[PDB]
C-alpha cells in the first residue's frame with residue numbers, strides 16, 4: 767500500500783502532480799498516482815480504495831482545481847470524491863497550493879468544506895527543493 771495518494775485536477779495539475787510523485791519516490795515514499803498505479807477494474811471503487819489505503823493525502827490545488835466540485839452535491843466529480851474520502855477517513859491531508867485562489871467555504875458542498883481548514887504548502891518554482899523538504903516534513 768502507498769504512503770501517499772496524489773489527488774489532482776487532470777486539466778491543470780498533471781505536471782505538478784507528476785513532479786511531486788518523482789520527488790517523493792526519490793525520498794523513499796511509496797506513491798499512488800492514477801497514471802502509474804490505477805489498474806484494471808471499476809475505477810470509482812479502485813480510486814476510493816486507494817485513498818483509503820494511503821496514510822497521506824496530497825492535494826494539488828492548481829488554479830481552479832476545485833471548480834468542478836462546486837454545486838456537485840451528488841458527488842460525481844472524482845476529485846470531490848477523493849477529498850470526501852480523505853476527510854471521512856481522517857487522513858493526513860496536505861494541500862499543495864500552485865496559483866490557487868481559496869474559495870469561500872459556502873461555494874463548496876458541505877461534505878468537503880473542511881478541506882479548507884488544513885495547513886497548506888505553497889509551491890515555489892524558485893525554491894523547489896525547499897518546497898519538497900517542507901512537504902516531507904508534513905508527511906507521516
Ligand SMILES: OC[C@H]1O[C@@H](O)[C@H](O)[C@@H]1O
Nearest residue numbers: 773774775776800844845
Ligand atoms: O486524474 C484526475 C484526478 O481524478 C482522478 O482521475 C485521479 O485520481 C486524480 O485525482
Ligand SMILES: [Cl-]
Nearest residue numbers: 774775776777
Ligand atoms: Cl479531474
